[PDB]
Structure formats: C-alpha cells, structure tokens
Design a protein around this ligand. Structure first.
Ligand code: HM2
Ligand code: CO
Ligand code: CO
Ligand code: CO
Ligand code: K
Length: 304
C-alpha cells in the first residue's frame, strides 16, 4: 500500500472496550460481523420515516447527550494527546450518560468514535499517534439511547495552524450552515449539495462524493441519502417530522477518496487536507431544529 500523505496508522490498538451490560445496545452490537438486521430490512428503500412525538423526544435527548460527549472530546484536543486517548475519554463519557457509543462494532468498526486527522476524510480509527501542532482533526460522535441514535462532528485545530487550515475549516462550517439554512418542509434533499458545492467551489475547495448525510433515528444510517455535491439525484422531499444529518467533507485539493488497508480510513488520493462538520436535524413547520447544537455557546469550538 502506498500512502497518500504523511499520516500512517500507529498500532497496536489497545484491547477493545466493553460496554457494561446495563447499557441498552443496538442490534448490531452483538452481531458477529456487526450487521444491523433492522437496517438491512430497509436497505434500498427510499421512504423516509415521519417521527412521532415520543420519537422526537427520544431524538432530542440522545442528540443533547451526544453534544455533551463531543464537548468532552473538544476539551482534549492539544498537541501530544493520541486519538486513542480521545476515544477512551469519549467511550467513558457515553457510558456515564447511560449510552452506547454507536460506532463501536458497527460493521466491526473497532472503536467508539472516528478521529480523522488532516488528509483523512472520514472514519479514521483512533490510534497511538500523538496529535501534532498544526494538525486539523475531526472527531465524529454518535450515541445510542433508548432505541435512538444522535450524531454530530466538528473539525478542531491542534495548537496553531496555517492559513489554509483556517480557510478550509471555516469554509466547511459555512457550507454546513448555509445548507441548514435551507432546510424546511417542501425543499428537495438534492438541493443541499447545490448550496454546499457552490460555496466550496467559490473558495477553491472540492466536495467529497463517496460519503453522504443520512436519515437517522431508530437506525444509525437510513433514508434519506444526502449527497453534499451539486446536481445529485438524491430521492425525496423534506417534510415536518423528518430527521437527518448534513455532514459535508470538503478538500483542499481534488475530491477523490480512497480507503486504507484497514478497510475504514478514507483519505484524499492526493494527500491534501480535508475537513468536515455535522449536525443531526429535525424538519419543523418553520424550518428545522438543530438537535446537536452546542448549548453553552453560539459557536463551534474552532472559532473560539
Ligand atoms: C456515513 C456512514 N458511516 C458509517 C460508519 C460506520 C462505522 C463508523 C463510522 N461511520 N457507515 C455507513 N453505513 C454502513 C456501511 C458503510 C460502511 C463504511 C463506509 C461506508 C458505508 C454510513 Cl452511510
Ligand atoms: Co460514518
Ligand atoms: Co452522520
Ligand atoms: Co457522524
Ligand atoms: K481531516
């Protein structure tokens, strides 16, 4: 395997983390290949669940907890901490909130969150590499509670970073907020990619194409599929009661991605940097509710 940039995996990984048996688990938690029977029963289906008031309350709760655990991770982004240490803290924060960390064993993913440094587009595996000043890192969290999943992620600066890092991270966030801004009953899901790419292109950046936002609720990843690039053919129209994520992955160089030999890590084929932000949203009659919004500040961590 020819790596595309300077990053390399740092093994071995510490032994897998158990979840106290008292934490409720999703069906794939104990599946040997980590498959989700319930998600497979709806594979290829375009229909989009309309949540009930019990559901909405369930989504509100797990999404607030998820935000709390992301804020914990944020607190740890300093040079020299390893992504596995971050993951460890995150694992413990889900347990303490009586939640299961959704990524854990999902299709056999070995950790409790995804940490994606620099050229890693998404799904980086927490490992022994200490964060380096100048690095940018995304931590993507998903929690499961009472039958519901809550998902968000933010890109962070490690120490001081260069101007390009700053511009990439800022633009990406803007891409995300301009798409949220358009969410309301009646809008087609395929429209968001137009907004996202329009802003990324205007700033010299490209939009990853192999990964998309997704519906989320009782299932981790379900309809709708939400591409973040222009002129896509996403299926569906937003309706009050729909819950889904927007999570654009934007790159300094080209949009092409490839996967490391570990079967998970998605990286830019050109080795340039990538950044991402994500919120889980609920369409309401006036627009949408940002379920994973930071509550103690108006801004994401990087700009502060
Ligand atoms: C966003 C997204 N993410 C994940 C994932 C899995 C483990 C940890 C973090 N993300 N799986 C998805 N569906 C399962 C099939 C799959 C696995 C790997 C890469 C792409 C799809 C989707 Cl849609
Ligand atoms: Co994912
Ligand atoms: Co997501
Ligand atoms: Co996510
Ligand atoms: K990255």
């Amino acid at each position: 395997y020819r790596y595309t940039g300077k990053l390399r995996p740092h093994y071995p990984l510490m032994p897998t983390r158990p979840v106290p048996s008292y934490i409720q688990r999703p069906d794939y938690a104990d599946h040997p290949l980590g498959m989700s029977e319930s998600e497979q029963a709806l594979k290829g289906t375009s229909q989009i669940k309309l949540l009930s008031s019990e559901d909405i309350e369930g989504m509100r709760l797990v999404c607030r907890l998820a935000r709390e655990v992301l804020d914990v991770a944020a607190g740890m982004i300093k040079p020299g901490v390893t992504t596995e240490e971050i993951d460890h803290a995150v694992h413990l924060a889900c347990i303490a909130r009586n939640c299961y960390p959704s990524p854990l064993n999902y299709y056999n993913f070995p950790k409790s969150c995804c940490t994606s440094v620099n050229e890693v587009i998404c799904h980086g595996i927490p490992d022994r590499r200490p964060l380096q000043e100048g690095d940018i890192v995304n931590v993507d969290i998903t929690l499961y509670r009472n039958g519901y999943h809550g998902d968000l992620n933010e890109t962070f600066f490690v120490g001081e970073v260069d101007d390009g890092a700053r511009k990439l991270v800022q633009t990406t966030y803007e891409c995300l907020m301009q798409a949220i801004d358009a969410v309301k009953p009646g809008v087609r899901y395929r429209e968001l990619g137009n907004i996202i790419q329009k802003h990324a292109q205007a700033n010299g950046f490209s939009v990853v194409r192999s990964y998309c936002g997704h519906g989320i609720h009782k299932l981790f990843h379900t309809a709708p599929n939400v591409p973040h690039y222009a002129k896509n053919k996403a299926v569906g129209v937003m309706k009050s009661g729909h819950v889904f994520t927007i999570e654009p992955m934007i790159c300094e160089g080209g949009w092409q991605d490839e996967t490391w030999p570990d079967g998970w890590t998605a990286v830019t084929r050109d080795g340039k940097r990538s950044a991402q932000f994500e919120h889980t949203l609920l369409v309401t009659d006036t627009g949408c509710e940002i379920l994973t919004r930071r509550l103690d500040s108006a801004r994401p961590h990087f700009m502060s």
